[PDB]
Design a protein around this ligand. Structure first.
Ligand SMILES: OC[C@H]1O[C@@H](O)[C@H](O)[C@@H](O)[C@@H]1O
Ligand SMILES: [Ca+2]
Ligand SMILES: [Ca+2]
Ligand SMILES: [Ca+2]
Length: 404
């Protein structure tokens, strides 16, 4: 068993009383439901609210989310119900607290009395001219316009950062990492960090565009899209690494399939289309996150089919991550934990076997480990293909479940 849970959305920082405090009230519900890991936002002080524009890294208190006290207060409740804690680690770029000799904002403040993380333009890639001094290394990954990109090839940086990371665990309680904007630095670099801080798991956010038909729809063969993920995992230690990646491949394909095109959920090999069917133990599947859904909606899921997804991800191979809004604010609390249970009751995991039984545009049926069968889609009958000794069980709005 192993299930993740993103414990926040875009709007979270606004939360009257502090996000963590209101969350203390969702601990048992999440735990009892079957979750095992929770993903909390960037705890650090951030120029921006949501925290993806970090500066004073050790400055936990400044957070719009809550402070050091409450974060622990909250991570400990989780640990009390046996759920691990993940920290949204944002290090591809960073904002300098103050102005240097030139007027350009490149003098950083770590957040403590010493000079830890009190870096200068020297820790800014020389190719991010808008801030650099031209003396650092070259960016090892994508750049982020909005702010100074840190030169991770920098001896000091990899040092003070692991120390900072190691502190997050040793002080607050964090267990695992969720690497923000991983497309910003070579996997070679994530590896430095992952290994010298060894989290129970490190899921990264590598998000490339999906190839699309002239008509806006995503193509059917997404092999290239997912080969770029199993590869990034490849270059990071793979089998022996704590790192894993969100199955963006699955999101794009699934986004288009619930729309009467379930046939898209199978590759010529009889396998799943996302990273799921290639490396199921290194693929974190999901329905929507704080970028793709919520109030940013860069790529939301068909709202009237959001359950067809959970019916899919919470029973298939791969690690499913449940989205906040979805569990507490959409009227699906119960429906969701019922599955996690199924997944749990039947000892299903990241690597269970998958046996697609039907992949027609309006009907997708499957058998996982020959203990569970799920069908999503708008087609009243499929009795025709449901192995022997399968009693019905969980179901609802265009999805059904039969356990042996
Ligand atoms: O998409 C990668 C990341 O890009 C950043 O610019 C956004 O602020 C984050 O919310 C997002 O996780
Ligand atoms: Ca300092
Ligand atoms: Ca930049
Ligand atoms: Ca970068």
């Amino acid at each position: 068993h192993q299930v993740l849970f993103q414990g926040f959305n875009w709007e979270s920082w606004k939360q009257s009383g502090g996000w963590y405090n209101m969350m203390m009230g969702k601990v048992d519900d999440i735990a009892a439901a079957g979750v095992t890991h929770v993903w909390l936002p960037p705890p650090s002080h951030s120029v921006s609210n949501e925290g993806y524009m970090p500066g004073r890294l050790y400055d936990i208190d400044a957070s719009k989310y809550g402070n050091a006290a409450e974060l622990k207060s909250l991570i400990g409740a989780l640990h009390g119900k046996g759920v691990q804690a993940i920290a949204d680690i944002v290090i591809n770029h960073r904002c300098a607290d103050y102005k240097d000799s030139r007027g350009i904002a490149c003098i950083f403040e770590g957040g403590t009395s010493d000079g830890r993380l009190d870096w200068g333009p020297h820790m800014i890639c020389r190719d991010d001219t808008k801030y650099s001094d031209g003396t650092a290394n070259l960016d090892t990954g994508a750049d982020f316009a909005a702010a100074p990109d840190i030169d991770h090839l920098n001896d000091r940086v990899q040092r003070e950062l692991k120390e900072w990371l190691l502190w997050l665990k040793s002080d607050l309680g964090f267990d695992a990492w969720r690497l923000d904007f991983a497309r910003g630095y070579s996997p070679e670099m994530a590896k430095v960090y992952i290994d010298g801080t060894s989290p129970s798991l490190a899921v990264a956010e590598v998000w490339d565009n999906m190839a699309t038909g002239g008509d806006g729809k995503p193509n059917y063969d997404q092999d290239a899209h997912r080969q770029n993920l199993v590869n990034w995992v490849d270059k990071v230690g793979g089998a022996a690494s704590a790192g894993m990646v969100f199955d963006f491949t699955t999101k794009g394909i699934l986004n288009a399939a619930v729309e009467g095109e379930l046939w898209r959920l199978i590759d010529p090999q009889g396998k799943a289309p996302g990273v799921m069917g290639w490396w199921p133990a290194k693929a974190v599947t999901f329905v929507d996150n704080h970028d793709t859904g919520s109030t940013q909606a860069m790529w939301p899921f068909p709202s009237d089919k959001v359950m067809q997804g959970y019916a899919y991800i919470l029973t298939h191979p791969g690690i499913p991550c449940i989205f906040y809004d979805h569990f507490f604010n959409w009227g699906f609390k119960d429906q969701i934990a019922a599955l996690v249970a199924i997944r749990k009751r039947n000892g299903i995991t990241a690597t269970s076997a998958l046996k697609i039984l039907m992949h027609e545009g309006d009907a997708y049926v499957a058998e996982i480990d020959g203990k569970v069968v799920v069908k999503i889609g708008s087609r009243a009958d499929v009795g025709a293909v449901i192995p022997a000794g399968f009693v019905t069980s969980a179901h609802g709005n265009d999805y059904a479940v039969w356990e042996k």
